[PDB]
């Protein structure tokens, strides 16, 4: 086949300019297409042959000779904030590489720990909830039941429309029989030069 690599899965743009790069495992002869895909929508054609638009606003331009192709959006608005894929049509086995844009904001994480309720404790289970509602970047969550644990489920939304901050839900499922290990702590590590620890006993 042929591999198409998009190095940056997430990119930061602030209504100025964005340059998305696609790399190829073989010289494709400038046979590269670029697709726009909003979440919940099918991929839509933007550029074929790496230099030709197909009924798109003029801010979406594309260049690239061989083995390194680029798509530039010099007018990036809220419609431009979506995912973009790069396809090569040099070989029989077609390929993609995905990439997404993100806005530019500040920083500052928040955390909150919540014990399982009595209704859940009655029905043979205990789910401890760790909420990280507003932060920017990437974050890591560790569970400490006086010892590290790696049996929790983690979920992350997209980006907030207004606050422009990411969130994270960590659910730690522990049975009632194993519900005596001491205390439960949720620790969040971000780019803040120190972890945020919230604990219950």
């Amino acid at each position: 086949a042929l591999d198409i690599n998009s190095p940056e899965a997430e990119k930061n743009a602030k209504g100025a300019r964005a340059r998305i790069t696609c790399n190829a495992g073989n010289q494709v002869g400038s046979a590269v297409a670029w697709f726009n895909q909003r979440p919940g929508d099918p991929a839509s054609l933007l550029t074929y042959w790496a230099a030709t638009e197909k009924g798109v606003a003029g801010k979406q331009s594309a260049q690239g000779a061989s083995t390194k192709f680029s798509m530039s959006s010099a007018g990036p608005e809220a419609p431009s904030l979506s995912s973009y894929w790069c396809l090569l049509f040099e070989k029989g086995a077609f390929s993609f590489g995905g990439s997404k844009l993100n806005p530019r904001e500040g920083a500052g994480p928040q955390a909150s720990i919540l014990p399982p309720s009595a209704d859940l404790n009655t029905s043979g289970g205990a789910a401890v909830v760790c909420f990280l509602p507003n932060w920017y970047g990437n974050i890591t969550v560790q569970w400490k039941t006086e010892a590290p644990q790696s049996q929790a489920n983690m979920s992350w939304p997209g980006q907030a429309g207004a606050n422009a901050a990411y969130a994270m839900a960590a659910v730690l499922a522990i049975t009632k029989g194993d519900y005596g290990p001491g205390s439960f702590t949720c620790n969040a590590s971000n780019r803040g030069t120190g972890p945020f620890a919230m604990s219950l006993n």
Binding site: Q27, G29, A31, F89, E90, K91, G92, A93
Partner: peptide
């Protein structure tokens, strides 16, 4: 010059 192997050539 290079070519473009389409699906039929595959």
């Amino acid at each position: 010059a290079p070519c473009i192997s389409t699906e039929i050539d595959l």
